[PDB]
Amino acid sequence: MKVGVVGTGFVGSTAAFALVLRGSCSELVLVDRDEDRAQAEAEDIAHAAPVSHGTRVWHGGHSELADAQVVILTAGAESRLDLLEKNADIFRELVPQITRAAPDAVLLVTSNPVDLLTDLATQLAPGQPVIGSGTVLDSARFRHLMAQHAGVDGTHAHGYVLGEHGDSEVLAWSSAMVAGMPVADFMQAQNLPWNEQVRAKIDEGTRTYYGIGAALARITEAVLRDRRAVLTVSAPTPEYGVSLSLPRVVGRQGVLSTLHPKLTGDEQQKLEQSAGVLRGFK
Amino acid sequence: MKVGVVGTGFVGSTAAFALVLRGSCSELVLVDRDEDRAQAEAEDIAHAAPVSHGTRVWHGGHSELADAQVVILTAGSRLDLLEKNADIFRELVPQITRAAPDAVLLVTSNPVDLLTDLATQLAPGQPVIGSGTVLDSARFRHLMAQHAGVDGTHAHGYVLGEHGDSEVLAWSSAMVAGMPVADFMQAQNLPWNEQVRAKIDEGTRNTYYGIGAALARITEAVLRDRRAVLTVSAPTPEYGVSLSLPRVVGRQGVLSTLHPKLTGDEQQKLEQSAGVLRGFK
Amino acid sequence: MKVGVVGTGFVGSTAAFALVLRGSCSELVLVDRDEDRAQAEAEDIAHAAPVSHGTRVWHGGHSELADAQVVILTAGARLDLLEKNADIFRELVPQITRAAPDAVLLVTSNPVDLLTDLATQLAPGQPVIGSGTVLDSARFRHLMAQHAGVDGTHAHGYVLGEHGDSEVLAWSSAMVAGMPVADFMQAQNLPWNEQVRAKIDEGTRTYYGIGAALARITEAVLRDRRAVLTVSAPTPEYGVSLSLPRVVGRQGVLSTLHPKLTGDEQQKLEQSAGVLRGF
């Protein structure tokens, strides 16, 4: 199981560290324009590998991505709009280099804006699975906070953050669930406080790169182990004409299917306004 | 984090193996009447420890359980098994309470439900829990998830009541990816019907790897105070017996009980299940 | 990463349990003549996989070994004992080579040494390894470490030769924290004598230990770990398959490291090899 990360900024290297401490893969290659930085991160992360499951780590050029199952594209560079078209330029340079070396690797895009850059990466790489990290972390926070308030472990909480990664994203309260009940219903049965204030609180919370680092590793593990995990990753969503975060089953071949949630009229509305924002910039 | 397991039959040693392999605890004591088997299983399991986290394994008498956070009690006509097994418990549980009065007692011997009742009275003022239907609930989830084409963590569902032929599958509350299981099958256009459900029901009602691993999960829930929702067996006043329902489990043991909303039929089947146990009790 | 285990007696199933619970592989197949047992143990072990890294577990026929990186051959039923398992091997190994021609083949049946020789014959052009003295070497280390009072990673030592009573403990190279064990024991002012050392030698000479060892060998291959393991392989200097320390990786044994032994240890070794030369 071999993984490459392109761009060893903070996100790339935190993800690489997470992958290593976790034993997610057996080979990990760091690839960056600033070779030296790549060199230094690789060598520092190396002396960390878990005995029970070591990982060859090293830096190299794009040709080293040879046989990567997953490549995590973290490369990136004032209006959101010229962050957008700087990174588009960087992407047009890199993605073809990636496809050249690892034509079959699943491409995991994380640079901001992730949704639009996932769209770009998709067109620059038509014959490859391309996925954006999208709202994965935020969905994870949404669940973590609900579970924290319910007094139960996080695996017992279900909930999605949908749409555009950012202020525009939508919390699908309508589908939020704890121990197999709608959240309101769990809170009531447990005589715990639930209301607009508590939800509003969670809302501000849902919205360092450790969280994203770990998340990127879980998305990667889902692929590496052909896992069919449900993750709200960003992908081209034809109903909306743009790449967006919805829940998607993820495994070795990337996105295996997309299950659009049944939203309230108000949630569905925010979602479409979200999609509009992205349509323009696109 | 210290764990003791009493009675080193297959279940106890398989659990211990699971505990050590996952690094669940840093200290593990095997306690058995047959002090040579105990020492063998302890010296053998001792080898299986994972570097990235080691565990000190050894065998001892009941005094060695001192300061254990969890003790797994595996020592063991149904009615014959039961009383024969109750006698053993009346001997052992007090020796356990002697050595570790504030440890969580995890009962796994069959019949687990009634023996959890017995243990609870032999050891008042100490958290007591039976493994109950934990493994069955897990199978139930695993089978739905496998049929849904999704990882098991996205499946929710309980097996309630008596551990055995009488346990109830709470279909009414089976959930996948946030939806009722059928609604999810309808959304993925996967087959869902009585026969699919009856086949899962067979796989849920069935070598001790499944139970060993579950035993470790419950244990880890306590050691790490994780607030895991597990269908473990505890005395349930509404039924006057110890049976399995979903319970939040943490360091102090059962922190609360979540009585699920069942269909008439299920509640009916649960009460009959409780009757059977009152009958032995 | 896919592994298939063949023959689901206690060793194979314990090995499978260890692999699953540590997440050693993503994909695991149990294959046995007794397909009912295989199905039972596969369904049970499946229920036992940690959520982080999951493993798809199932049972099947030999054709299911398709694309295994490692196949653990544990099938088994003295000259007679040997002649019965040889027959079984002559039936199975070619089935394995059929479906998984590039799998590393990890032989554990007894006698492991001679059967590793047989399997090597039956499956040329494919890495073949026997579990040999891997577990024994681990106990040897564990027991010294336990007596020295330091974690086991800081003990070094090999059990060489024939798996069994004839196996050789290479005391002459035993090491604790980078020193010869005697020197370590003296520095820490602990007892070291013929009576302590024979009690260790005793604990060195249920299947949890071997299960976990088999997993470790398998993980070495799956991850290409370049681990030094005293596994069994044909050793031309002795004309038989024997346990020596070997660097084990994705392609199996990458090299053999012949240890320096005392004249006495080298003797016990060649005596050990003589026997096997008989079979």
Place this chain on the structure above:
Amino acid sequence: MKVGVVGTGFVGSTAAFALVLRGSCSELVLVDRDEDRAQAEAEDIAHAAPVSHGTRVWHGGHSELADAQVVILTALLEKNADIFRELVPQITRAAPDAVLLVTSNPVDLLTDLATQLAPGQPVIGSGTVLDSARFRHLMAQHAGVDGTHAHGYVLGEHGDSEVLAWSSAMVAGMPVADFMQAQNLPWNEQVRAKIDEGTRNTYYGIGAALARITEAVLRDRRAVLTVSAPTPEYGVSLSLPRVVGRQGVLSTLHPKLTGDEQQKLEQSAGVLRG
């Protein structure tokens, strides 16, 4: 198992991240003068927690270290002492039993200081732990084998003045040189000089190393680590190989060095006395 970290600079939060990712402990408190920083990272890190270990992570103040088994102090020496003089007593206040793991530079003297401020409590510094680990990793890499089969210590003062004990360097139970000879791999003053550099040189390695030291404590493992502690045959706090457990340093293993090796060591000892 409870761990707290004082000071959530890079070394602190990378150490905590590593603890949380490996599920090394169940509770983890970040304690910092800058409570806003401590708050997110507790919140961000909240998350890298694997499901099947798993850890409660939060921010708070010194009182919140209560019942900690290990406290990692990551919060120049001149200034850093004034800070220790304020914090260590606050730590000893709340967590009197905790093993005190000092990591700030200079870690050696700042360990001696902390030992002063906190008697009757195990105190150790991270010392040369990371460097001993690089040293071994680089030999192993060159030998073509896994890191566990390499043995080697970096001794003395953390920094430019530390001693690689080439005299006891070992691969697969042999002297590194003897292994490279048997394996037919190049070994020559040049190769070693390269290793030397890499050995003695971003906070991933130190983060992971801090976590491994913490786990040795938390799990009472009896691990041999080259941590810094007051060493009475040098009058200063030094890195030697020491057996480490739940009660901190259980013993000290003074390695047999060449005259030239013991040379640099004793030399550095004095450069320490001030």
